[PDB]
């Protein structure tokens, strides 16, 4: 009966809870009680790029740590060169409402999407010298919140409806569809080995999925409200998420529970973007009170503050070589800090 | 700098010129966000897979209209995209009284329309935007109140079963849902199927909001 199935599900959830409790011995904050603190670290703004004329939603660093892509509140997909500040490309979008961007590791393609409900794939290296619409992937029912490139032929998208999709580029068909969520999926992150990926939705739960098999492996809970940004550790064995509770949370994949909580009493605004530093000693979190904070990943004390913005930070990223961190906010400017 | 770097600089300058020209062109366009109780009166207001845009023009002014009734998701996670709209159009059907249980749950259309209006016109983001609320079903209402009185809702008195005070009570009850009576205004226009003066009303409202914004900008309001 339905009541019997519900009771069995509750018993299974209690079983998961007691297994997680049994697997735990101590706390990560307890073990890292003899490691010297990072002290105080002070970045400064080395470049400022001011080409946009509206709010900036998404950004993504290239694989060469020299190029940037940014999406605005108009037909404005701008590809910048960071070192010399000259802007390389300007792409006009058919739909002015965008919320996501991604740069392919091959440096050939860029993905855009938003409230327009379809994911547009643009190619940059063509004979005619312009930028053309390579593909227009369709099939979702709600708005796209994040899109990432697996390779030059596989793309993974998370939509407003409780679904995730892995696509095919030559023929625009969903090769695989993931349906396990109850609530809008807001963030998506990919593993270093391009075999697993983590999705974060509006129901305060983070789900880890297998790319090829097509079924979920683990579900983590603990957040008070919806989560908006998820980032992988460089190792691939841990991940940190940010929510609207003014708290960030670091979970581990193998132990299947939470490890650290980053939160302070003064800050009450939400978190819009989260990224990790190389070697995973720092955690950069963009808050809604026009700031951008830096936390020590091994112990919860707070390091320097990157306060240079006049509006809320909407995106932030760290290069593959770990040189500089680039933050874009709702004011048209975005900055590079070193 | 080498020759190639100089040419790259020139390319950046040209792209900047084009971007500035496009932004200046796009700045002279007022935006209206259209909301309604599904298929209530929106189709008529538009007659004269995601969101759908309309690009009508009138009297040396370019209008851009967004219809987002096809989203069917959590509206609190994307409403902030529309923070800079010039105005909000709200469509409510006057025939919505009786005709109860249109939604799956047992409640009148009118109460859910009121709930939507209260959600929109007291939102955190829309603290300085006006509403151009339309009332769509003007001549079905006469027959409905002829055949059936106002009893299924509004426990308070409606006066009588004539169109005048019935419409007056409906408009008064809708116009007082808002709390910030100073920072925003409601226009409360009635409309019928054969009316051909809706765009004039929208033009007047838009001009009023533009004048108010200009006065507030120069430090005089």
């Amino acid at each position, epitope marked *: 009966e339905l009541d019997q199935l519900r009771q069995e599900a509750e018993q299974l959830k209690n079983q998961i809870r007691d297994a997680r409790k049994a697997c735990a011995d101590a706390t990560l904050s307890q073990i890292t009680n003899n490691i010297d603190p990072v002290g105080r670290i002070q970045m400064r703004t080395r470049r400022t790029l001011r080409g946009h004329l509206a709010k900036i939603y998404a950004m993504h660093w290239g694989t060469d740590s*020299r*190029l940037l892509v940014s999406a605005s509140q108009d037909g404005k997909l701008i590809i910048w060169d960071s070192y010399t500040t000259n802007k390389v490309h300007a792409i006009p979008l058919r739909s002015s409402w965008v919320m996501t961007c991604a740069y392919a590791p091959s440096g050939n393609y860029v993905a855009c999407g938003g409230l327009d409900n379809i994911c547009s794939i643009y190619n940059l290296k063509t*004979r005619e*010298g*312009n930028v053309r619409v390579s593909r227009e992937l369709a099939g979702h029912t709600g708005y796209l919140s994040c899109c990432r490139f697996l390779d030059d032929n596989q793309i993974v998208t998370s939509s407003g409806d409780t679904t995730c999709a892995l696509w095919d580029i030559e023929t625009g068909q969903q090769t695989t569809t993931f349906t396990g969520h109850t609530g809008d999926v807001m963030s998506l992150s990919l593993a270093p080995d391009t075999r697993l990926f983590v999705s974060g939705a509006c129901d305060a739960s983070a789900k880890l999925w297998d790319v090829r098999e097509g079924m979920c492996r683990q579900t983590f809970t603990g957040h008070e409200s919806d989560i908006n940004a998820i980032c992988f550790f460089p190792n691939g064995n841990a991940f940190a998420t940010g929510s609207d509770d003014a708290t960030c949370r670091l979970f581990d994949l193998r132990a299947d529970q939470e490890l650290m909580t980053y939160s302070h009493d003064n800050i009450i605004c939400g978190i819009t973007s989260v990224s990790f530093s190389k070697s995973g000693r720092l955690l950069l979190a963009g808050y809604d009170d026009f700031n951008c904070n830096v936390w020590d990943a091994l112990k919860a004390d707070r390091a320097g503050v990157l306060a240079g913005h006049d509006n809320r930070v909407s995106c932030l990223g760290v290069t593959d070589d770990g040189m500089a961190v680039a933050t874009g906010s709702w004011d048209s400017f975005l900055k590079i800090w070193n | 700098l080498s*020759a*190639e770097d100089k*040419a790259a600089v*020139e390319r950046s300058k*040209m792209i900047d010129r084009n971007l500035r020209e496009d932004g200046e062109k796009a700045a002279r366009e007022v935006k209206l966000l259209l909301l309604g109780a599904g298929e209530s009166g929106k189709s008529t207001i538009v007659k004269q897979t995601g969101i759908v845009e309309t690009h009508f023009t009138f009297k040396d002014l370019h209008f851009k209209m967004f219809d987002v009734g096809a989203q069917r998701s959590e509206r609190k996670k994307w409403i902030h995209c529309f923070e800079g709209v010039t105005a909000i159009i709200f469509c409510v059907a006057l025939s919505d009284y009786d005709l109860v249980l249109a939604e799956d749950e047992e409640m009148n259309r009118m109460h859910e329309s009121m709930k939507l209006f209260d959600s929109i016109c007291n939102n955190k983001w829309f603290t300085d935007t006006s509403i151009i609320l339309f009332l769509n079903k003007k001549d079905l209402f006469e027959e409905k109140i002829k055949k059936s009185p106002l009893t299924i809702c509004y426990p308070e008195y409606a006066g009588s079963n004539t169109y005048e005070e019935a419409a007056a009570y409906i408009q008064c009850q809708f116009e007082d849902l808002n709390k910030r009576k100073d920072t925003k205004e409601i226009y409360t226009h009635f409309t019928c199927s054969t009316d051909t003066k809706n765009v004039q009303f929208v033009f007047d409202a838009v001009t009023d909001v533009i004048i108010k914004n200009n006065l507030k900008d120069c430090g005089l309001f």
Partner: single-chain antibody
Amino acid sequence: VQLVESGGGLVQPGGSRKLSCSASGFAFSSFGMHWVRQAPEKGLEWVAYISSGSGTIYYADTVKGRFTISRDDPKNTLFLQMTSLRSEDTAMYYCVRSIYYYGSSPFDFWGQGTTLTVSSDIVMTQATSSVPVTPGESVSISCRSSKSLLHSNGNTYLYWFLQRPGQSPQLLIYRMSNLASGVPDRFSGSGSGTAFTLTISRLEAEDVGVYYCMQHLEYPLTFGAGTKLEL
């Protein structure tokens, strides 16, 4: 990706001429243009450069004042104008497209060119003038520059062009290390300041002609004498 030329022919001294280039198949407004002259039995030499948007115009030291070059965008045409025509210019002209941004490959496509007959600066040295060869071997060609072409930004500026018999040249290596598009992986380039080597491994047919090394550090463009390979 199709450029055509017209207006050439036989002229008398003191006349004026109008050479026209028509483009089809790409975005003209984003591509700058070059005019490069080739003598009937000598090497390449540059004539003129126009940038995108008609902002910067450069002429050679032996053509300034006489020559005048413009372009019309809506009709997609490129005009060059000849005044006080003399006996030193009897040669055949080429138009070259080029775009400049990070990762670009200037001097990508070359038109056929047209013939016209009548009735300091960095010097590039080509070591050799003729090298017989047989298929299945490896060939190294050396090109020397008077001053170092390695700019302070870590970027080197040398372009290798190949001219097969009866055919407009094509790009082989740009910036001394980068392979062009549509070219096999056999070719390679290396060297250092004031010394450059082009290496070909596993020679095959359709590989005879002349090879040219060009600098791009500062105007005017200077090429080499020309190195040939024969079967």
